[PDB]
Design a protein around this ligand. Sequence first.
Ligand SMILES: [Zn+2]
Ligand SMILES: [Zn+2]
Ligand SMILES: [Zn+2]
Lengths: 89, 130, 271
Amino acid sequence: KRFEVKKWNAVALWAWDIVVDNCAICRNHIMDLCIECQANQASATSEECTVAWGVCNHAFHFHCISRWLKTRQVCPLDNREWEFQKYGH
Amino acid sequence: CGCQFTSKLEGMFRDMSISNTTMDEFRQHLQATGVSLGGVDLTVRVLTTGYWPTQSATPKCNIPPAPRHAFEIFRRFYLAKHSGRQLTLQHHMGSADLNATTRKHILQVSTFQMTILMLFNNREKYTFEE
Amino acid sequence: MAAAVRQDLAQLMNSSGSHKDLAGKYRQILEKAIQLSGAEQLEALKAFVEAMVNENVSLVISRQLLTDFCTHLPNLPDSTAKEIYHFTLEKIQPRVISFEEQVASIRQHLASIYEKEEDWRNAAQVLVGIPLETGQKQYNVDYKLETYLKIARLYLEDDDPVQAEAYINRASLLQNESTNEQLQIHYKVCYARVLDYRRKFIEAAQRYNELSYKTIVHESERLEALKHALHCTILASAGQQRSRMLATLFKDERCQQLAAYGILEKMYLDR
Ligand SMILES: [Zn+2]
Ligand SMILES: [Zn+2]
Ligand SMILES: [Zn+2]
């Protein structure tokens, strides 16, 4: 051949995916509503119960983390202050 | 300045340290197992999306066959001994050293012209449509 | 005459010419191999697969002829063309990143054919192998939803729903992106089933009851979904949530038509 490649320095990005698991506050799942949505409210009409992503890349139900923010505000998996970087999956 | 905006930057250069340290493990695998023509000379880099933003769109162009084997080997290794995370390939990053051939002068393509030159090697006399 | 076909493929690989002429000549060779039968046809098609995956052959030449090879395959009965399905699936590996549409078609065909021979075990594993996560070939949200739904349904029939939970997981991830309502209805039925299987009888009854008051679902399927809701409610944990569902199920007149109508009637009225 006329042109042959010898060296290559590509950058391979990695991202934690399949982040399905469990909203550890509600202990039901990362999705499929929460304890405050399958045991508390019955109507569940015009409702949401999304996910809640923080700066430390942790994931919980929006309902579960918001209620947890009443007393404590320190993201019980660490001591980070848990900024709200995203909602939903 | 503070934490929130600045800590993201301090993680970018930290991931640059992550890249070479991850390659230190990769280099250890290179010392143990020899690589064939698909993998003659590779220095791949591993970064985290939590600090380094996407350039424009992370495109999905094709790959030349020799880099195809090299990326396949690295992806297979990363999915075997580093399970729990899958890699995404992109073209808007990196470089290359294209050995051309009166002497043998190695060119340089920044992972943009690799696809174009590879098609030329397969067959010359192309155009914008090709 | 498989050796002659292989020799023709090898000679055509080293030939130089326009892409259209090469594609036509290869297509004629493929048609001749299809006209064969028995082991001769199997070896001829195996050589055809080997030629397509060869590096020298152009990608456009490779991608379409493999697609055309795949299209003629369902015509051949359920037999010899399946050891080549495994052969072709493993063959696509150096260029598995180049194209995944043919791999997707083969896996979908293989899963359905495995589904024919009462095999939800191997059909699941084959269809798991799909790289839906990639997104390079941006599988339309329905297709990823359809594939994830099929794996979950296959994993439901043999009942190993440790992965089916993890597959109904990624199914709902893409679910709130899709458009097709019938696919959404088919999803909610499967999701309601998944709740019924694992331990979520009370949650399955809620999902079944929500799906019971639908219009596009067949009246027989609507009655069947409600019948599952009644069965799930009876089998659910006896508590406040179950009592409310029992009260709700004591309203449908199509509950009365069911044979278990007496069962919840004694249940809710207290006995
Ligand atoms: Zn929760
Ligand atoms: Zn909630
Ligand atoms: Zn945290």
